[model samples]
Target: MSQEQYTENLKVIVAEKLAGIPNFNEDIKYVAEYIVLLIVNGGTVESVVDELASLFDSVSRDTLANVVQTAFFALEALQQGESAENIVSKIRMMNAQSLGQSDIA
Candidate 1:
C-alpha cells in the first residue's frame, strides 16, 4: 500500500485502540514524552512499559495504554526496516494533521 494509505490505516487502528481509554489529553505533554522515549529505545512494548512505569510510577494506566498503542505501531515500522528519520517524519506529518493542518495531503 502507499505510505499515505498505510498511515491512515494506522490512525484508525490507534483511534480504535484508544476509544475506550480515559482522557490522556489532560497530560498530553507527558504522554508524548513517554511515547517518544519508547520509539527511541526500540524494544518490545512490554519492555517499554516496564521502563516507563519505573520512571513515571504515577502515570495513569489509560494514558500509558494510549502511548503504548501509538508507539507500538511506530516500533513495528522501525522493525520493518524503516529509517528513524522517516518514522519521525511520518509522526510530524500526523501531528500536523491533528493540529488541523488538513492541507498536508
Candidate 2:
C-alpha cells in the first residue's frame, strides 16, 4: 500500500487507542502525531518513542515509559514484515498495558 494509506490507517488506530485511556491529553495526541509524521517522513521506528520523549520537556522517565511502550508497540507492529495496515491492526488488538511501570499510556 502507499505510505499515505499506511499513515492514515495508523492515525485511526491510534486515535481509537487513545480514546480508551482516561487521562490521555492533547500532548499524547501531539506525541502520536509526531510519531505518524515520523513514519510518513521515512523516519526509523527503532527508537522513535524515546526520540519523541525528548520533545517533551516536563515528563519524567517513568511517565515516558508508558508512552514508549505504547508507541513502540504500535510502531514495531506497524513496521514489522507485513503490510503496514496489517501491522497496525495487530498492534491495535494487543494490549500495551504490561509494558509500562507507571500509568501513562
Candidate 3:
C-alpha cells in the first residue's frame, strides 16, 4: 500500500475500534491521535505502551488493557503486512470470547 493508503487505513481502523468500545466519545480522540502520532514518529510498541500506561493510569485495568491491546493490534497489522480487517475481526472475536468467559466465571 502507498503511505497515504496505509495512513487512511490506520485512521479508519482506530476510529472504528475506538467507537466499538462501550461509552466511546470524542474525549478518547486524544488517545487515538497519540497512538497514531507515536507510531508515525517511529516510537516502538514498548515505548508506546509505556506512554499509554501513564496516560491511562486512572482508567480501569480492563480499559487500560484494551487500549494497549488495540494499539498493538494496529501496530502489528502495519508492521507485519497482515490484513487489518483480519486483525480487527480477531480482536472482536477475542473480546467476545473473554466476555463469555467472564460471565461464566
Alpha-carbon RMSD, each predicted model: 9.6, 8.3, 6.6
Ranking by lDDT: 3, 2, 1
Residue 57 CA error for candidate 2 (Å)?
Answer: 4.2
Q: State the displacement of the C-alpha of residue 36, model 3, in Å, after optimal TM-score superposition.
A: 1.1
Model 2, residue pairs in steric clash: none
lDDT of each: 0.52, 0.54, 0.60
> Model 1 — TM-score against the truth?
0.41
lDDT of 3 by residue, 49-79 (tens): 6776676666555664565466557666776
For model 3, what is the C-alpha lDDT against the true structure? 0.60
**TM-score of each candidate?**
0.41, 0.45, 0.50
Tens digits of per-residue lDDT, candidate 2, 1-105, equal 457655665665455445344455465545666666665665454565466667764655555445445544555666663343554455455436434457657
TM-score of predicted structure 3: 0.50
lDDT-superior candidate, 1 or 3:
3
Candidate 2 achieves a global lDDT of 0.54
Question: What overall lDDT, based on C-alpha atoms, would model 1 receive against the true structure?
Answer: 0.52
